[PDB]
Design a protein around this ligand. Structure first.
Ligand SMILES: [Cl-]
Lengths: 53, 53, 53
């Protein structure tokens, strides 16, 4: 019996971790699609954004 | 601060849902771009990541 | 061993920021891939989803 406001924190962490999974997969999807351009980061000529878990 | 923590949770929750919308849309975009390959997950040859709730 | 909550909020916020960066970059990637169609949103014939302010 704890979790007073941390119940919203736990649900959010679940959402974040899950969303990250989708985002990273989307990133792999984009890097796959833009392999000819060296990946999506290179294709966009921008610094690469990574997950930090 | 307590009230600050509540506000932080509130905004972050709103940020999560907003981001999730962009992510899901990006996912639909990727699925469209790889529809012929069965979607981005099948194209990626990976277990698909979903974001529900 | 005290106040993990307040700290968790900051950690989560940065996680969201980090993720948003990837998501936005992915969106730019998708818009680039569908530039001829006016971006992924228009390519998907959907209302564009955006990140918070
Ligand atoms: Cl994404």
């Amino acid at each position: 019996n704890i979790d007073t406001m941390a119940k919203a924190l736990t649900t959010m962490q679940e959402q974040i971790d899950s969303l990250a999974a989708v985002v990273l997969q989307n990133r792999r999807g984009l890097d796959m699609l833009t392999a000819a351009q060296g990946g999506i980061c290179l294709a966009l000529d921008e610094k690469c954004c990574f997950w930090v878990n």
